[PDB]
A paper describes a structure:
The 26S proteasome is composed of a 20S catalytic core particle (CP), to the ends of which two 19S regulatory particles (RPs) are attached. The cylindrical shape is formed by four stacked heptameric rings, with the two inner ones composed of β-subunits and two outer ones of α-subunits. The multicatalytic properties of this proteolytic machine are provided by the subunits β1, β2, and β5. All active CP subunits are initially synthesized in a precursor form with N-terminal propeptides (β1pro, β2pro, and β5pro) that are autocatalytically processed upon CP formation.
Remnants of a tryptophan- or tyrosine-containing octapeptide stemming from β2pro can be seen in proximity to the β2 active site. However, because these densities in the unsymmetrized late-PC map differed from those in the C2-symmetrized map, we analysed the sub-dataset using cryoSPARC’s 3D variability analysis and obtained two distinct conformations we named late-PC1 and late-PC2. The late-PC1 was resolved to 2.7 Å, whereas the late-PC2 was resolved to 2.3 Å without applying symmetry during 3D reconstruction. The most striking difference between the late-PC1 and late-PC2 is seen in map densities around the β2 active sites. Although the aforementioned octapeptide is located in both halves of the late-PC1 and late-PC2, another distinct density is found between β2pro and the octapeptide in both sides of the late-PC2 and just one side of the late-PC1. In addition, the two 15S halves in the late-PC1 structure are further apart from each other than in the late-PC2 structure. We conclude that late-PC1 is an earlier assembly state than late-PC2 and that the octapeptide represents β2pro remnants. Our late-PC1 and late-PC2 structures suggest that during β7-driven dimerization of two 15S half-proteasome precursor complexes, the maturation process initiates with autocatalytic activation of the β2-subunits. An unidentified density was observed in the complex with remnants of β2pro in just one half of the late-PC1 and both halves of the late-PC2. We speculate that this density might be remnants of β6′pro or β7′pro, which were cut by the active β2-subunit, as it was already suggested in previous studies.
Numbering used by the authors:
A (entry chain R): 2 to 224, 226 to 244
B (entry chain U): 2 to 206, 208, 210 to 247
C (entry chain T): 1 to 234
D (entry chain 8): 2 to 150, 166 to 175, 178 to 267
E (entry chain O): 8 to 248
F (entry chain S): 1 to 249
G (entry chain 7): 1 to 81, 117 to 276
H (entry chain P): 1 to 250
Write the structure that this text describes.
Amino acid sequence: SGYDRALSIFSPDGHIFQVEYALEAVKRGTCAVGVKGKNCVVLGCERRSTLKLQDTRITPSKVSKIDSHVVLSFSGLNADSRILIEKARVEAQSHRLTLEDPVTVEYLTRYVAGVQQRYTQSGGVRPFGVSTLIAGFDPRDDEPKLYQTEPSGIYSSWSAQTIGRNSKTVREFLEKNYDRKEPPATVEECVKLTVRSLLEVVQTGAKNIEITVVKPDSDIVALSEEINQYVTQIEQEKQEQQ
Amino acid sequence: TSIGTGYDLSNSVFSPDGRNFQVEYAVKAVENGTTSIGIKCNDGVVFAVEKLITSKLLVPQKNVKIQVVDRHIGCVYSGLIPDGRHLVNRGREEAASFKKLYKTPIPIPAFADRLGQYVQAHTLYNSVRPFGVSTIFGGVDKNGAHLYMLEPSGSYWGYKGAATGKGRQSAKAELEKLVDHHPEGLSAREAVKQAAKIIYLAHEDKKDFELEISWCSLSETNGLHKFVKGDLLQEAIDFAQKEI
Amino acid sequence: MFRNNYDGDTVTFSPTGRLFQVEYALEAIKQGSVTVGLRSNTHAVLVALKRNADELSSYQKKIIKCDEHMGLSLAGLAPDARVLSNYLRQQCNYSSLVFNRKLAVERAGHLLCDKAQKNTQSYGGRPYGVGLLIIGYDKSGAHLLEFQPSGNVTELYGTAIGARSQGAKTYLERTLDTFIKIDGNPDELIKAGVEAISQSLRDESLTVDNLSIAIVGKDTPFTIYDGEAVAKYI
Amino acid sequence: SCLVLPLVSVGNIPQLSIDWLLNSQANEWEYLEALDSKYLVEFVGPLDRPEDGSDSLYKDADMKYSSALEVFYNKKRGLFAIQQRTPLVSVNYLNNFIVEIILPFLSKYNISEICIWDSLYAMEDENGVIVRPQEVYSLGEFYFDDEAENWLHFTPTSFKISVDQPIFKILFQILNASQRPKALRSIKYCSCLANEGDNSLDSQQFLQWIISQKVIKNAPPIVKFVRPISWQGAYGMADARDKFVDLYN
Amino acid sequence: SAAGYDRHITIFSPEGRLYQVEYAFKATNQTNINSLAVRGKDCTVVISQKKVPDKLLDPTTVSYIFCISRTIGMVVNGPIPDARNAALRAKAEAAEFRYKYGYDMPCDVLAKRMANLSQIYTQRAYMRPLGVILTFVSVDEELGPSIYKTDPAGYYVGYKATATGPKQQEITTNLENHFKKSKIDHINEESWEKVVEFAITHMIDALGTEFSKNDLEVGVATKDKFFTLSAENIEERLVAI
Amino acid sequence: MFLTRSEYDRGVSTFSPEGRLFQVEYSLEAIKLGSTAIGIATKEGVVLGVEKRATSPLLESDSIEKIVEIDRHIGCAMSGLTADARSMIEHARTAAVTHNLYYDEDINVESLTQSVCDLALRFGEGASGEERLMSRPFGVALLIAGHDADDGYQLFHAEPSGTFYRYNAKAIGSGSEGAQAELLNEWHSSLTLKEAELLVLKILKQVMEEKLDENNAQLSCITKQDGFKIYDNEKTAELIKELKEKEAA
Amino acid sequence: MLFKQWNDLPEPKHLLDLPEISKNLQSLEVCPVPKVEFPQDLDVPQYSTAVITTKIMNPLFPKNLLQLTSIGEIKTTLTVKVYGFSFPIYSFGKTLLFSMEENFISISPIFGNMISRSIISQLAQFSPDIIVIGTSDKIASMKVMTENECTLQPPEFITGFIGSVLTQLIVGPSKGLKFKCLVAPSEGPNGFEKLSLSDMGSLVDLCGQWLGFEPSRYSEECYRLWRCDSAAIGAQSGLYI
Amino acid sequence: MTDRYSFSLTTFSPSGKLGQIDYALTAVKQGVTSLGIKATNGVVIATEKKSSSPLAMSETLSKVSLLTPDIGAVYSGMGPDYRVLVDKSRKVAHTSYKRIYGEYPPTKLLVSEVAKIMQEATQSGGVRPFGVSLLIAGHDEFNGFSLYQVDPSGSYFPWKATAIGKGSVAAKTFLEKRWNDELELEDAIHIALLTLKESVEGEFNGDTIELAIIGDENPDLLGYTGIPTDKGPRFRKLTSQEINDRLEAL
């Protein structure tokens, strides 16, 4: 087109094409779902099929615990996500040292968005091709917080958001099944909803779904086999419906 | 060969023939400027500028084409006005620094060398463009009268008579004729008359014009650069008109 | 067509010896409104026609005061105009505070030429695209300067720049001797300037909201009339 | 019997050469007809005349405008020359342009020769078709009698051809056409290597080389080079330099 | 010709060549001026052809021979702006060497320093080579008469006798023939005037033309100082021979 | 005379042949993609109204906040890219707090708008000679409202070009043209706070694709007595109901 | 700046960056042609005047004052082994109006060529009044042309949808038609052009003269349309002064 | 902004190859042939001293330079690059090892430093890769004799015998057919002379051949006498007379 070879060039219709290309790179990776419950948050992630000769003991977790009350998931490029996670953890510890108060979810999301924005202000750097979902609870109440951050530096607040490849189907399923008027009161309902949403695009739910649960008072419990139990129960209920 | 495609979009690029085309384009821009000439008499230097009669709204007092660098240095230029003005400012700074250091007026060859170095330094990088002005300057120092001309490439030479602008060529011929008519020497007043004659001969373009003549001589101005007064200016104009 | 290959930056000369970016910056002047300046012997007056985005918008501040003895009117790009106005204010304050001396009009013109010539020879910067009309009074009397953003300053009795300024310039040149001898009566000079700027109007007339006047003089500090203040001058 | 078809290429050297060809000797060239331009970005412009003061190529006095795709005819030597102003729309419409516009023109006038003028940028030589960069110009020839059913043969010049180049598709469509003329005998291809800029002198030298090589059978030598008046407006206004008194002096 | 990004900077062509350096070499010979350098028993002589096609130009202001220091003289082939730039750089380098190491700079070390600067120019993308060829002549206290030459490519080497310019091949061939005839590799004259006369005669024979006092520029380097001969001295040498 | 591509709109520091900067125009085109934001300043205070254009039903209502509090006496509305607007808002808040610290007085709205325009001018030369800090100009347009003793209630429109205007009623966004026309035809100095709010709601409903409701419509006010505040959903719903009642009869 | 990037070299400007129709750049096959369908119930003979222009000239045709009404649309389709756009046609008084929306990003010139050919073919049956309003980026000042006189300078020319319409009127299949064309200078790509206040005023005055309306009300409405955040003005108020 | 960085001059081709490094290798292969062969009690380095118009002094310009008293190097490619690399290598040998451990560095570590410098050159957006290939011959107490080849990319390899430049393939074949595990220094010198005789197009005398040896210690070249522990240089350069005498003999 001629207006897509730099990040500092505006297109005649008013678009920045490099940001769109970064978003396209994001939409190439594995899916990632974040669901907000009444008093809990659930992060689901899709793992590609594990090879036979791959070590499963120390395989990385798609959900990274930034702090004892804040967790992060990503979609896009893995190494850029590692860099962003390292910076976020350093910033959280620095803020805790400076102000004696652990970071809030919104503050950390804003810092991540600011880093991603700063990495778009020069022609000699490549912006991170990562879209992040930040979940947690502010360390003074029981209000769940879920945020989505994009490569351009834009951060938004959501109740149930999916990012990654084939995210349209999961987004439609969440829209047709999740109601903000009556969010899942218990953790089990939210986990089941997340698993069912992920199953719409995952070929095999026994070995390609990862579930993490965040609850108030900075608990954060990652589910192990239990995901297999949820998948089997969902299949049984679906066959009963049939 | 006057248009070298592929090797003319950057300042510091050699063409396959070994030529810098930005410098030659600056020379072409110089060739479209106003005609300015300079003559060297026995003990002085005379500068002449053919200026175009602009609107009468301009103040005829504070508008002077010939630039003054130092009390013993006169300078004219042809090309782009901002570049010539900046070069004159740099020359003034250099002369001030030399006089402040060594307690004497700066000799003309040293001033010419410093100006040439400064101009040449602008043909070494692709982030700057060469000056689009050719500058004829001169003065009087302990060794006598000196007249120099400096090109956009940073090359300068000492001339018995120098001419630049649109009507340079014929003017140069006239200057050569001057050397063929006064080989032994020339006085300051004769130099002023001949400068007026050459300017009148070489301005045949048409649009009325005006003439500005300045001189710096040891036996006429005590080694100082002064503009020609009204009586001698009118005498030179009348002589130039009568010669045609 | 061949011009399109040599108009990328201010470092490139055409094969015919041209600097097209500076030419485009000069051509950017006519996109602005018309301002007129004139002085006879003791007072200098600037007249400006202000423009608005629509009915509900305010009017552009054509004339900005630089110092008690110096002001200017701008015609062209707003960012460059603001930058140069702030630069001139800083230069006047710097001269007064450091040298214990009021900045001269010619010195201000030289400073503007020095600042403008730099952007026409170095990569990475855009040339200024605003012309300026500066009026001042100093120990040498009253002075009017026209500053061309290519880096040029001219001293003249009167001039006008902007859109449709040719008619005003022709009127000023034709009647040069009429107003050049107006001494001691600033009102006549202001009225002459208003009449001059009225010649550039096209399907429009001067009103109380789109006319601004600036006056400086020997015993008169630089002042600006706008709104009802110019209602007496129509 | 010989057709000249310029291509929109780097520096517009062929097209400018066409302007060099027609306006150098306007006595022997006259306007013939405007072809269909549904595959172009066709424009509307006034007539063009030689600078030396000769009669315009458009003999008819009832036409005051001009189109993009036009064909001029030389009856003294029977040469058809095509002129294009606007570039071809996209690159996948070359086939339609060949098989629906110039295809009827072939065998419409029984043309016995095709000549294709092209300029190649040496930087974008992805396939390395250039083997001897010592020379600047190149010539290739192809005969239907000596060949049955890359495919060209090149003289000892600077340089096979790349599949991505338009010349390859032109040759493929010309040879593979089921509506090809029966009088088409010889195809010749002149190419030049040059950069982008003021290519007036480059175009003149390219035309000089073409005339010297006698690629066109009935191409007379040119003794005086005259530019069209429109080239006086390439840099803009004729007196634009005089306008900027504050900038030039 | 070049093709690609290797037209404005110094990077390798697909054939492993630096085109900008070669074009600078081409630019060196655009002055159409030939120079000669010959070392005697206890002196060194450089003679440069002087052309004044314009009679409006002052002959005394035309000079390509420079005095770098007390003992070192330099001759430049190429445009005069880069010549003067290189002259100033050489003067600064020689003075700094004397200040830093406590003794005068020999010719070979200065030539190597300039060659290293040229190498910097040829490797850095944003710097361009100087289209000039430099010839340093001196009488070193450890090596006797010395002539060294450096080029835009960053290559420097010493010569028994050297010639440069568009017509350097004929002068070089004549010098080689003279050396083969004599087989002493230098000039047997014990006076610098005789060496200057020999160089003048050799230049006249090689170029096939006769010069006046204003058509030559002569510089002589001795053990103590390097000095440029004036018009009267050249005229006296011409009258002698 | 041929059709060739022109590249005068690529570089920010490049003039068009007539002397225009197309990057600022493209930034305004980008601003036009934002949601509609309206601001009406009357003698009883200033009213700002925005549309919470939710791309997804699950998006949080409080996630979209295009009306901020620069200071207790200065409110703002934004249209365009949110990333640049965040930095602009932070800089405006910092300037206001610094002015309060060093002067013990509220900053005039005109001063703050001038400061924001000086920040937006950073893509070129700075106002005080400061260097460049932005590779591209901003893509956000701001409507700044405030109250002070010097000029009563002030409303300003600030552009990425660095030039700001003073408006009685200004609307910019996706439906900028229609809202601006309605403001031009339906504004008077006798408008009260309630009338201005109802006019804002009616214009928003006119320029909104979906049905008007407090979910996608945020209204804020700034007055001398109560500073800057933002109406909640209940009050906006009551205003919408009253508007429906008055439009019915 | 210390330097500019070595690799910042612009691409050749011989080929435009027009939108792609088919992703196969090596198809070596005939490309499909867009199909245009003109409404069969427009009742052309009921109207004796037709105006052909683009969307940028919308302020020249106020809606309420001229009583614009909708009749029919032109349907353009294309199949690639998918492009479809709607072209509404307006009517004020007894005069029809065609206002095509140019977009060099998403709309190829081939659609414009087909639309122009269809419109010229349909309107040539009855030969009504033909008025052409458009802009060209190669003209110094405003130009007025008729079927007999060409006021364009030899370098100046007209390209685009207006250029296609003029080409079809002059050398198209239907010839002999009488038309008046008004061209104004502009800058910018197709579909995103910008004008100046003087050019807008001149266009408004000439359009009012050629349409027969009172200058006062017509000028007021046109100015109000221009200043209401019209895309043609751009940032004249925000960038200048 | 656009002034605080420069784009990388060396980039990967779509095939997975660095074009600048390949072009530097091509430039090296166009240079004069330089060879090196290792014996059981020494290493031999040889090269051809190509000259300009026969008026220059060939002794002034030396293509074989002493890096350390026990380590020497030769090059094929561009002269100024070799000179700059030699100066930097001597400075690095003194700074990194002599001023730290009191000893000159071993051959492998100096070769590694040179390779690191060249690799940093190939990874820069302001300079092009070097256009030389280096044959470095050295001796150290704990590794005996060693010969290494360093490429413009910064890759160095050990060699029993090798050659670079124009006549490299033929020289490699000849050395492969000639080299044996029981070779001695004199036999290595003879084989090197035979290999050079097949590549020189002009006069094959001592004035156009540069030869150096890493043999035994040379007390006569030390410059002082009195310290039995101190040893003379292990790097020696053969004079023109010695080369001529070897040429006349076997």
